[PDB]
Amino acid sequence: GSMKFVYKEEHPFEKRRSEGEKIRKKYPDRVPVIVEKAPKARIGDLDKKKYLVPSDLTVGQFYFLIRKRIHLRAEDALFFFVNNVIPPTSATMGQLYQEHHEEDFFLYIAYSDESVYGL
């Protein structure tokens, strides 16, 4: 592993957890996501990080939504990196959560302008 975070890193466990354990209970179809702008990424840095996206939302959909947050067109480059890996466009946000939720009932992710975790 070699991922760098600040919002998802700063927000204590009791926080990322408190929010998650609630967003999960309150929203069974949604998944608390902590998107991030991978290091060295040739894209704009995000100050939101938090994302309340559904659970059926495919990676392809999630992208298009983040692309705007960074100002990228479908043609533009933008790759998601969770736990330092790239999720399948066919996979659903809900899956990434259950398959990459780093505890705290949260799901943190990254995005770079390359096929590598920004770096």
From Swiss-Prot:
Residues 3-24 are annotated as: Interaction with beta-tubulin. A lipid is attached at residue 118 (Phosphatidylethanolamine amidated glycine). Residues 38-119 are annotated as: Interaction with GPHN. InterPro entries: Atg8-like (IPR004241), Ubiquitin-like_domsf (IPR029071). The keyword Protein transport applies. Pfam families: ATG8. It is found in: Cytoplasmic vesicle, Autophagosome membrane; Endomembrane system; Cytoplasm, Cytoskeleton; Golgi apparatus membrane. This is Gamma-aminobutyric acid receptor-associated protein. It comes from Homo sapiens (Human). The lineage of its organism: Eukaryota, Metazoa, Chordata, Craniata, Vertebrata.
